[PDB]
Amino acid sequence: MKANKPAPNHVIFKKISRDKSVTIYLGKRDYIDHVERVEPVDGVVLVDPELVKGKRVYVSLTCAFRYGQEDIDVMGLSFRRDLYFSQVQVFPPVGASGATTRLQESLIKKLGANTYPFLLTFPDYLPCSVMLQPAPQDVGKSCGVDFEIKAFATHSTDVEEDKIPKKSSVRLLIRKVQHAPRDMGPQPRAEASWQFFMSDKPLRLAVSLSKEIYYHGEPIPVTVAVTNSTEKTVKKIKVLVEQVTNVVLYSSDYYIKTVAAEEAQEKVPPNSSLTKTLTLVPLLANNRERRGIALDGKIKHEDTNLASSTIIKEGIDKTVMGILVSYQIKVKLTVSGLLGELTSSEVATEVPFRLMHPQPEDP
Amino acid sequence: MKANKPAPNHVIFKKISRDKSVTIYLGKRDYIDHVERVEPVDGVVLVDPELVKGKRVYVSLTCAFRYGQEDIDVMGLSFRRDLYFSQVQVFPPVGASGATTRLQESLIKKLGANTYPFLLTFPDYLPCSVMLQPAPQDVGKSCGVDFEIKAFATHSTDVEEDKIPKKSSVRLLIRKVQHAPRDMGPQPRAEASWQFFMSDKPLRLAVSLSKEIYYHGEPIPVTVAVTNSTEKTVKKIKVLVEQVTNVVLYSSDYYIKTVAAEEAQEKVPPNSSLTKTLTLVPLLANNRERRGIALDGKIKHEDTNLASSTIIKEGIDKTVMGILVSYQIKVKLTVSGLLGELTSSEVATEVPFRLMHPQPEDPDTAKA
Amino acid sequence: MKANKPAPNHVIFKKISRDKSVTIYLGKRDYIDHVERVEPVDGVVLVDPELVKGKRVYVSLTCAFRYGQEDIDVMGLSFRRDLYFSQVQVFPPVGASGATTRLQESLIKKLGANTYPFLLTFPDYLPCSVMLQPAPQDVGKSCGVDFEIKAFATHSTDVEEDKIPKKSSVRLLIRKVQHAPRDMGPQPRAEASWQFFMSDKPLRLAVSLSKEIYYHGEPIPVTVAVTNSTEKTVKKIKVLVEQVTNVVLYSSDYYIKTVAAEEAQEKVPPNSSLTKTLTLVPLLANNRERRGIALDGKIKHEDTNLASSTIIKEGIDKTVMGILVSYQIKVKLTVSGLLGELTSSEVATEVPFRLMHPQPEDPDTAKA
Amino acid sequence: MKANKPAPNHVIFKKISRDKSVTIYLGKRDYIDHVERVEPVDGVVLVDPELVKGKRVYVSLTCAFRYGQEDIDVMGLSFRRDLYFSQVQVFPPVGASGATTRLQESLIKKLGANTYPFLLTFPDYLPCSVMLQPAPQDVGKSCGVDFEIKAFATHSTDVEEDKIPKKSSVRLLIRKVQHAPRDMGPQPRAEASWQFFMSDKPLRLAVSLSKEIYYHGEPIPVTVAVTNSTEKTVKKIKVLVEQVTNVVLYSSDYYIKTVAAEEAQEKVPPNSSLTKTLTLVPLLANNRERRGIALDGKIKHEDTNLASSTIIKEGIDKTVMGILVSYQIKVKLTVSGLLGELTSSEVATEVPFRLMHPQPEDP
């Protein structure tokens, strides 16, 4: 649904400039990021001998945080912040160097003599793809972190000044996806217990989670343990997955939305304890309203889903991340004290967990 | 318990002067004030043909702020300030005019030929009935705003000077009560946050109220939401209705008294959010101590209750109100940091609201 | 330069059919469209008694979007879409009706007994005159929205079928021009900020425009405010008026051309703010290249200029407009970070505005 | 104008609780803060033998940042943040200790046997007194940093719980004033030069300041040097002192107000250079509008003036300061290029400087 017109071998994406002088081919549009390493963007560019004659072609990788652009603002408020930039010359063959990777190696000996490789690496202090669009009930414009690959040809002129025509260039908007670190090791269970003293008699709530990290689509088995030693009854038990977004660059916007839930009108009277095991699966398809939450792509694109929990590297400033995504489990019990209105009291707690994509697989 | 000796038809109050020459009848003693309009004081006066012979009778409406020993002194004791005065001639029939209202119309054709009507209107820049009496622990004398209707006969003398004998006159102390208009402001909401010494986590308190205006006697459902992300524990939660009086005429006296209170009994352990819904009803009967607060009548009278929130009209000077009454909800949390004494720290916030009497039941349904 | 041979009284255009049987006269060739209302096309037709004997004459108004080789093809060449059609009978006098307007009234009593009036109105959901011709560097054929008035005579034949000879008919290609209504939106304002790689200081750009609507030829005073808190220097400041065309009927073609530009010559050193006020006037005469932009007439005609900003009426589908014209102001700053090539970075922003013709001079002052 | 009813010896402030059980005396209400050290708050409390019988009395120092309180907020938004707290027991004589300072020593042997001393010190990571009240054209509630001394008596009850009646306590709102460090050493001049190239021909502006630190009330001699090598003329020269406030705790509010100014319609045509020396003195009395700027006290109090430049100590987090005050000199030149409207172009620059109170004087 998103653009990047393929051509099969296995699956390679291409884009020609209006100029038709330069064409860019990429192995994929989504690049893996597993804390320790991050897939480099290797590919090739098909040039037109005479069209690119006299000029040179380049390819660049740029990460930028945006805020405002493409938004009905009474006073057009926009802000961009570059978090990374790297450029390489792809046309005039630099050095005797060639297809450092197999992808470009086969692509070259499959496209022609006018095919040249390029390789742009990602640093380890960059956030992953994050996007947000304020719902109607939300305040604060939309923002996000884009990763753009750009192939462009530059020629010089008499007036002693170079030119970078839009026509002779291609713009590819790739995405950086978060994947569980390779070789992690077994993980404990997310524990937690609370003691709500009502009239000094206590109402205990204990929440348990199998692992600390869950994959997108993977069911989350939440175990609730309510030990009602009070005189009141727990009329209901609500268990929902909450996503917490935190803009940390242009304006400190804040969001907490439910991306999964499962409520039940249970019954836990005095001197009685109950233990249930629910299962929730937070997905973007869960709700029709995609506004207000933090996705990894455009609200319209098909291959777009919920963003993965942010993973700030040791020693890095969180603001450099632009937007911060996190997940947790909220369990609210509706206690009932029939007398005045203590029967409305709804206590709650939360247990944090991480959400991301399946570990990477080796050859 | 308050005086104004009735006589039934439905319920009409009467008062004869010592002179027995003039008698005043009033439909009621409490007149409605719903921001947009205010019930006019219509009634009649029964005169004695020969006793009122040669002289004329009048009726007057006067609003005055007092500040001294006796808040009824119709002349002077400490400090008085007239906020309004209007007078009309009731005896010698002025014009062919007659019972402009049904009340006086039936009252006249039920009392006699010596019964004459009168009608005194209220302006829209006057405060309502407010009274205060300093408690022992209070400083500053008692004060209030009185509304007095007065029927009196005046005759002239040889020395070229008129006389207004006390005996040939009646003094009625009516009251102006506040009733809900038609539209009330937004839903009362407040949000507080605290970061204590040596702590990097917040303690949030959110207060919610159903409506912005509540009637006297109507229960106020307060919803408290404490999100304790701190290391300490909220040992207690106090919710009370506070009345704030502010004398603004002779001396800027100030008062804040609790007219209702609730101790929601449950705590909020660290790293856990709690949400409770209490219900308080501020009433005068709530406490035996009626000294120090702002009532709408005398501290002794039965039909006396708490004063309604002041409603200053647009463009009017607050000082013209004499005394200013207001209400709010105070929620204090007793946090506890076991170490030095941070365990005594008691944070608090308030959410204002309006209190008055039920909207006027005049939706055209009442066929008088 | 465009045809419609006049004849003075003030200025009236005429056209005779080859047949010489019918002649059409029009008060003008350009009709005003000010959002609320749109000038009706009134005029008269001069017929030749015997030449038009036995047959009837009509006049029709038709709005059509074309997309092909010749944007005048009254039948079909590539793609045509009728957006409106209305016809009236002008020869055999329908009803006792006559010159509903003064124009036809004087024209009739100045031409003869063979002069008959007609009046065709415009609906309020039609676009104005828009034309486009792809430049060499452009892709997508030419298109446009034509408004055609047609006077034609129809007679019948033995074979039971009517005939509409081309010879006995006239084709007038009028145009609908956009004129300011009465109220224009808020003052155009924009604010941008940039933080470049390895830099922690912001670069602010604020753009201001006097009004929201400007007339053709009227100078546009753009005020730029650059607050360079960065380490780099703004070597250049470019301010240009951009026209954005959007074909929305047969094929979604897209255009963005510069119809005005100014190179304010002054720089903004680091840690120093600068505020300049440029003035641009977007006109068709501005550039020799008229290909690729959206005009209101033929690329050759003299009285042809830039099209006015489209004004889609509330509740109407934009596609019904055929082509969409809009204007804006683009301000690009050429920052310079001497190190790798951050010195090439050219940031930019835009502020939209409306362009059209002077408000209709119909304030009751004009006594026609 | 501010309260703290004195009693002469030299000048000592007193305040009795409603309870009349405790009375607090303070040497002064404004305590000096010269980067290296900060005046400790020493004083005494006069108790009533039987009224304080059975209970103990204490005195505490507390620094807190506020935001919102006492403001017409549609949804009462308030926030308090404690930056420091220290408490001492003043009634039951702790240890054989006594008047550590002369102040309390004379005060005691001048008040009675019911007079007890106390001493509360200030840490070196606290901001000074700062207050702000948004003007009508301003957005964001009012805030500030308060320093409160509190004397209160506490007694216990049957229900096993202590009580701290409001009546038996006094609240003193002292202020921490910034004074130039003692023994600084000579300071250079605040220099700066800029080059505005118009059509490649330059227009130079150089600003000079005598010292780097100025005292409140002290005249600031600004020297402007315009070297107009351009074709246009500098029709005007504006020199103003700007105060820059920056809320850094509850919400990042921002302010820039002119607290002094001196404009002149000078004339500097092509190939000509001009050098002027203006003198501005930023004071609170300068303008009637005290709303929108950062003072050191209440907008109503007499002894209230402009806040001093913030001095963040090495290694401390600026957010801990609550509000950040700073000063600078802005010089805007109104150049005129008669042709289109280049004659409106108004260039500008700024030179920062510090503002505070006179150095401290030793015995």
Resolution in A: 3.3
End-to-end CA distance of chain C: 27
How many Cα atoms within 13 Å fall on the side-chain side of residue A115? 17
Residue D352 lies in a domain: yes
Instruction: Say whether both B175 and B221 belong to one domain.
Output: no
Cβ within 8 Å, pair A76-C191: yes
**C274, C264, C257: which is closest to C206 by C-alpha?**
C274
Cα C70 to Cα C132, C143, D201, distances in angstroms: 11, 8, 53
Residue C3 lies in a domain: no
Instruction: Say whether both B63 and B162 belong to one domain.
Output: yes
Sheet of B115-120: strands edge to edge? B6-7, B12-16, B22-26, B41-47, B115-120
Q: Rounded CA gap, C331 and C234, in Å?
A: 12
Residue B1 burial (C-beta neighbours within 10 Å; 0-12, 13-18, 19+): exposed
In three state form, how does the secondary structure of chain C look?
Answer: CCCCCEECCCCEEEEECCCCCEEEEECCCEEEEECCEECCEEEEEEECCCCCCCCEEEEEEEEEEEEECCCCCCCCCCCEEEEEEEEEECCCCCCCCCCCCHHHHHHHHHHCCCEEEEEECCCCCCCCCEEECCCCCCCCCEEEEEEEEEEEEEEEECCCEEECCCCCEEEEEEEEEEECCCCCCCCCEEEEEEECCCCCCCEEEEEEECCCEEECCCCEEEEEEEEECCCCEEEEEEEEEEEEEEECCCCCCEEEEEEEEECCCCCECCCEEEEEEEEECCCHHHCCCCCCCEECCCCCCCCCCECCCCCCCCCCCHHHHCEEEEEEEEEEEEEECCCCCCCCCEEEEEEEEEEEECCCCCCCCCCC
Set of chain D residues whose Cβ sits within 8 Å of the Cβ of B350: 76
In a 3-state reduction of DSSP, which class is residue A347? strand
Set of chain D residues whose Cβ sits within 8 Å of the Cβ of B189: 75-76
Q: Rounded CA gap, B130 and B325, in Å?
A: 8
Q: Rounded CA gap, D265 and B139, in Å?
A: 62
Q: Which of C223, C267, C276 has its CB closest to that of D342?
A: C276
Any chains having at least 3 CB pairs less than 8 A from chain A are: B, C
Which string of b and e fits C92-125 if b means at least 16 CB within 10 Å? eeeeeeebebebbeebbeebeeebbbbbbebeee
Instruction: Say whether both D93 and D241 belong to one domain.
Output: no
Cβ within 8 Å, pair B278-A340: yes
Instruction: Say whether both B178 and B244 belong to one domain.
Output: no
List D38's β-bridge partners, or say none: D33
Query: How far does the CA of residue D347 sit from the closest CA of chain C (Å)?
Result: 5
Token digits for A232?
Answer: 């009141």
B136–chain D Cβ distance below 8 A for any pair:
no
Please state whether at least 3 CB pairs lie below 8 Å between chains B and A: yes
Q: Rounded CA gap, D93 and C101, in Å?
A: 108
Cβ within 8 Å, pair D78-B189: no
Which string of b and e fits B172-197 if b means at least 16 CB within 10 Å? bbbbbbbbbbeeeeeebbbbbbbbbb
Chain D residue closest to B193 (CA)?
D79
Q: Rounded CA gap, A267 and A235, in Å?
A: 5
Chain B residue closest to D167 (CA)?
B137
Query: How far does the CA of residue C195 sit from the closest CA of chain D (Å)?
Result: 19
List C332's β-bridge partners, or say none: C238, C348
Cβ within 8 Å, pair C189-A82: no
Query: How far does the CA of residue C213 sit from the closest CA of chain D (Å)?
Result: 20
Residue A4 lies in a domain: no
Query: How far does the CA of residue B240 sit from the closest CA of chain A (Å)?
Result: 15
Query: How far does the CA of residue B277 sit from the closest CA of chain A (Å)?
Result: 6
Instruction: Say whether both A124 and A204 belong to one domain.
Output: no
Q: How many domains does the structure of chain D reveal?
A: 2
Q: Rounded CA gap, D130 and D142, in Å?
A: 11
Residue C200 burial (C-beta neighbours within 10 Å; 0-12, 13-18, 19+): exposed
Which H or E element spans position A240?
Answer: strand A233-247
**D249, D250, D76, D144: which is closest to B192 by C-alpha?**
D76
How many Cα atoms within 13 Å fall on the side-chain side of residue C265? 11
Biggest distance spanned by C-alpha atoms of chain C: 90
Residue ranges in chain D assigned as alpha helix (H): 102-111
How many Cα atoms within 13 Å fall on the side-chain side of residue A329? 33
Q: How far is Cα of residue C179 from the mean position of the Cα atoms in its chain? A: 10
Instruction: Say whether both C172 and C190 belong to one domain.
Output: no
CB within 8 Å of chain D, chain B residues 179-218: 186, 189-197, 207
In a 3-state reduction of DSSP, which class is residue D219? coil
User: CB contacts < 8 Å between A and B, how many?
Assistant: 47
Instruction: Say whether both B124 and B41 belong to one domain.
Output: yes
Instruction: Say whether both B286 and B139 belong to one domain.
Output: no
Q: Which of B221, B269, B277 has its CB closest to that of A345?
A: B277
Cβ within 8 Å, pair A79-C347: no
Set of chain A residues whose Cβ sits within 8 Å of the Cβ of C190: 75-76, 78
CB within 8 Å of chain B, chain D residues 156-175: 162, 164
Residue B1 lies in a domain: no
Cβ within 8 Å, pair C189-A76: yes
Instruction: Say whether both A283 and A318 belong to one domain.
Output: yes
In a 3-state reduction of DSSP, which class is residue A105? helix
Query: CB–CB of D167/D161 below 8 Å?
Result: no
Q: Rounded CA gap, D80 and D71, in Å?
A: 14
Residue D178 carries which side chain, given as an amino acid letter? Q
Q: Rounded CA gap, C116 and C45, in Å?
A: 5
Cβ within 8 Å, pair D195-C271: no
Instruction: Say whether both D134 and D206 belong to one domain.
Output: no
Among C125, C149, C181, which residue terminates a domain? C181
Q: Rounded CA gap, A15 and A24, in Å?
A: 5
Query: How far does the CA of residue B255 sit from the closest CA of chain D (Å)?
Result: 14
Q: Rounded CA gap, C220 and C203, in Å?
A: 25
End-to-end CA distance of chain A: 29
Chain C residue closest to D349 (CA)?
C272
Sign of CA dihedral A116, A122, A123, A126: positive
Q: Which of C191, C194, C344 has its CB closest to that of A75?
A: C191
Q: Which of A76, A82, A87 has its CB closest to that of C195?
A: A82
Cβ within 8 Å, pair D78-B341: no
Residue C89 lies in a domain: yes
> Which position has the token pair 């002008």?
C90
DSSP D82-127: EEEEEEEE-SS--SS----SHHHHHHHHHH-TTEEEEEE---SS--
In a 3-state reduction of DSSP, which class is residue A289? coil
Q: Which of C264, C266, C276 has its CB closest to that of D197?
A: C266
Please state whether at least 3 CB pairs lie below 8 Å between chains C and B: no
| Pairing mode, strands C80-89 and C115-120 | unpaired
Please state whether at least 3 CB pairs lie below 8 Å between chains B and D: yes
Query: CB–CB of D108/D95 below 8 Å?
Result: no
Tell me which method was used to determine the 3D structure. X-ray
Q: How far is Cα of residue C58 from the mean position of the Cα atoms in its chain? A: 28
Cβ within 8 Å, pair A342-B264: yes
Q: Rounded CA gap, A141 and A164, in Å?
A: 31
Chain B residue closest to D164 (CA)?
B344
Instruction: Say whether both A283 and A363 belong to one domain.
Output: yes
C342–chain A Cβ distance below 8 A for any pair:
yes
Among B182, B210, B245, which residue terminates a domain? B182
Instruction: Say whether both B77 and B130 belong to one domain.
Output: yes
Cα D82 to Cα A148, B205, B226, B337, D142, distances in angstroms: 45, 16, 19, 14, 17
Cβ within 8 Å, pair D196-C266: yes
Q: Rounded CA gap, B336 and A194, in Å?
A: 17
Q: Rounded CA gap, D161 and B235, in Å?
A: 12
Q: Which of C195, C344, C351 has its CB closest to that of A81?
A: C195
Residue C191 lies in a domain: yes
Residue C61 lies in a domain: yes
Set of chain C residues whose Cβ sits within 8 Å of the Cβ of D344: 223, 275-277
Set of chain D residues whose Cβ sits within 8 Å of the Cβ of C276: 341-342, 344-345
Query: How far does the CA of residue B348 sit from the closest CA of chain A (Å)?
Result: 20
Give me the CATH number covering residue B300.
2.60.40.640
Residue C257 carries which side chain, given as an amino acid letter? K
List A237's β-bridge partners, or say none: A264, A333
D88–chain C Cβ distance below 8 A for any pair:
no
Residue D1 lies in a domain: no
Q: Rounded CA gap, B153 and B51, in Å?
A: 10
Cβ within 8 Å, pair C278-D345: no
Query: CB–CB of B326/B243 below 8 Å?
Result: yes
Owning domain of residue C104: 10-181
Give me the CATH number covering residue A98.
2.60.40.840
Token digits for C18?
Answer: 């080859």
> Which position has the token pair 């062919």?
B96
Set of chain C residues whose Cβ sits within 8 Å of the Cβ of D340: 262, 278-279
Query: How far does the CA of residue A201 sit from the closest CA of chain B (Å)?
Result: 9
